[PDB]
């Protein structure tokens with residue numbers, strides 16, 4: 001029965017035809033279960049194990065590389081008894097790699113935690129219903145609850161389903177809805193209908209929502225909806241329907257792949273249009289029986305030379321280590337890619353309650369009377385540190401620690417806080433944290449008492465569990481609590497009647513301890529306490545008290561204030577009627593004012609500094625909360641989102657004010673405003689969406705169910721470690737530590753990571769360009785192969801893979817966080833740099849092919865072959881007379897390829913050093929600025945000597961150790977590449993913007 005909030009209690013009962021006194025009959029339950037299904041959410045099970053392996057082989061470059069292995073297999077098979085000793089070696093490695101990185105992705109993606117299967121850490125286990133079955137309440141599985149069921153809830157209970165309140169048993173019902181609406185103060189409920197069918201959750205004051213918990217009181221109700229029809233149900237589906245795009249970097253890697261794909265085939269067809277001349281020469285060396293093997297011999301060499309086979313490995317290792325470093329900051333990264341995207345964050349949307357704040361009411365100020373003398377009245381004001389329920393913090397006066405117990409006024413204040421209290425504090429040994437028991441605004445008094453420790457009780461040698469009630473327990477032994485006059489909405493105060501306990505003070509008599517909204521309690525005080533004595537309440541005294549209450553109630557403080565008082569001579573229990581709260585106020589009169597306490601849902605300690613760091617990093621911070629605007633703005637002022645006295649006319653909107661704006665203005669408002677209050681879950685998602693429409697990488701920070709949709713839509717969702725299960729499953733990162741400043745450390749980490757990544761991506765892709773130039777050149781010139789796939793794969797994965805990882809450790813710039821976020825559309829390579837890699841690529845191709853040719857034509861120990869008898873080496877056998885002389889197999893010698901590979905390697909070591917800085921000269925930024933890069937080159941080089949000496953290797957790699965005369969040539973060929981780039985950079989700084 002949606003809309004139950006607008007209907008009366010009788011209407012809701014009639015609607016389901018159920019008796020409020022007995023509950024549904026076992027027949028109606030069976031039928032309602034049938035018509036409404038169980039009270040649970042569907043299992044979110046997607047992508048199994050084999051489903052991941054599939055998508056692993058869907059990458060455009062992988063299929064090309066794979067189809068390249070298939071073609072390599074046919075070749076290894078058609079490999080005659082000339083080199084059939086290690087022919088199938090090529091197809092193997094090509095497939096081995098594809099399987100290596102593959103199983104890696106599966107092992108990587110499999111690591112995950114479900115959203116609905118984990119959401120059961122929020123969906124109550126049990127529920128309490130009355131059913132015709134029996135007279136007593138029944139405790140059943142919450143999943144077995146159906147619409148129409150009569151449910152009972154009491155303090156501490158987790159509401160099992162969306163319920164229409166029928167009857168309130170206690171004097172009032174207070175509900176903590178922070179996990180769902182973001183409200184920071186428990187909500188007083190009622191049973192009357194809420195007319196406006198469009199009333200938002202914060203307005204449904206006659207409804208109880210599944211997932212929330214009872215702060216105080218007891219009530220009976222009728223289930224309105226269950227399963228996916230509940231408020232928490234609507235949000236989950238909302239979360240499930242939101243789509244997420246690929247990371248900007250991943251979109252660039254995909255674009256690269258699509259473009260590279262076009263270039264490959266394009267060159268494949270290009271060479272083809274250079275072999276068409278074969279249909280001119282009069283010679284038949286194999287129609288369609290043997291002669292055709294050479295085309296596909298270069299086609300696979302091209303696809304292998306163009307594709308950075310080692311990139312997937314370098315990137316994963318980089319991101320993985322990045323995730324390790326974050327974990328040391330207690331930041332659990334759920335998605336490896338976001339480790340970097342986080343660096344591109346331009347706007348950080350953040351929930352308020354439980355995210356920007358602790359969501360734990362804290363008393364931070366209090367005062368008692370100091371002295372009264374005529375029109376003069378001075379107060380003893382104190383401040384209290386600590387922003388959670390933990391009994392950890394101090395009491396200060398004029399910013400200095402004092403012993404509360406030395407102020408008799410404070411002893412009575414603590415006493416009232418401890419006794420006039422129906423709640424307590426506890427230590428969850430499981431979660432390892434202190435938790436409230438009952439009402440937050442009461443537990444705040446409990447922890448205040450533990451901090452004050454007015455009797456200096458010994459607490460150093462206590463366990464977390466004992467420390468939670470040590471000082472309160474001591475005070476509870478001083479007086480016997482006879483009864484309590486529960487809080488009432490008209491009176492706005494609560495009191496307890498106490499009789500003397502310990503025989504230590506029997507000449508005291510009965511007392512009444514009162515607390516409540518200041519105005520009404522103070523109006524009912526005829527006396528004011530000063531230390532231990534009492535003076536009459538006079539205009540001047542009342543004035544000073546109210547003026548300080550006023551200050552604390554607004555401005556820089558904006559605290560919730562509570563006045564504390566006691567009735568020195570309370571009525572005899574006999575002359576008091578305790579069954580009607582309408583008489584309580586009168587019993588709470590002729591009181592003696594004792595003091596005031598100011599409390600609030602405090603901002604977490606590191607938020608203010610964090611927001612200032614973001615500002616300098618060009619990152620906006622926007623508050624998006626379900627709480628009322630007054631509290632939203634107040635917190636914004638405390639953390640610096642707004643100036644202490646700034647006017648927020650058009651920089652703070654409520655959900656309604658926002659909706660009253662035409663779409664265009666709404667969109668613009670997201671760029672100007674920083675505080676959105678009284679908003680719904682879809683409002684948060686909407687705001688994120690507007691930000692994203694301006695091409696801004698947005699992050700969202702939350703803790704509750706109402707943050708789940710937005711957390712998912714944001715490029716980077718950040719959930720509080722102490723938040724809900726939903727919010728965490730919807731996030732890429734979790735602050736296990738609840739430290740908001742870790743977000744800034746993550747951004748910094750993400751910026752450094754990305755800058756290094758750009759350098760190694762550039763490095764690797766750069767070498768592929770040169771490699772393709774080498775292949776194309778030889779295929780075009782008709783010359784023999786200078787480099788072969790097996791050699792290219794080893795260099796692309798090891799020789800260059802190691803230095804690429806080292807670049808990942810390049811020291812970050814000192815002003816990394818003193819600059820705006822880079823653009824998400826910023827291309828990794830373009831403009832001048834495109835030309836640089838263009839020139840380097842050409843330089844590598846010519847140098848590698850040239851080195852090979854050199855050995856073939858000038859090497860003092862190679863054949864003195866002529867240029868075109870080398871470009872026509874293919875016609876050696878058949879036409880020996882033309883270009884005769886020597887063995888036709890020398891054209892397949894390992895010396896020339898080794899000469900070419902050694903040049904590729906040496907050149908890449910140099911370009912690795914050119915990759916330390918985009919435009920800085922190696923003289924300005926020395927090679928030793930990254931010790932790792934220097935070592936990686938040593939490792940890569942010694943691995944080269946390995947592949948050239950350990951017999952097995954040089955055999956399968958088609959190589960052979962070169963001579964010192966040949967190496968020196970390799971150096972003279974390679975080294976100059978440093979001079980080339982050392983020049984292109986110079987041209988970029990002086991005559992360009994670099």
Ligand SMILES: C/C=C(/C)C(=O)O[C@H]1C(C)=C2[C@H]([C@@H]1OC(=O)CCCCCCC)[C@@](C)(OC(C)=O)C[C@H](OC(=O)CCC)[C@@]1(O)[C@H]2OC(=O)[C@@]1(C)O
Nearest residue numbers: 255256259260263266267306768769772828829834837838
């Ligand atoms: C990997 C090796 C090679 C040789 C390759 O073909 O790379 C090209 C290519 C796909 C791009 C190019 C290469 O293009 C050329 O050199 C010109 C076209 C050649 C056609 C020849 C027809 C007979 C990069 C490599 O060239 C230079 C010289 O820097 C730069 C850059 O790459 C990046 O920004 C890398 C992205 C991670 C990309 O233009 C990129 O395409 C894109 O969409 C980008 C934005 O990506």
Ligand code: BEF
Nearest residue numbers: 182352353625626
């Ligand atoms: F809890 Be959030 F402030 F909506």
Ligand SMILES: [Mg+2]
Nearest residue numbers: 351353354704
């Ligand atoms: Mg919240």
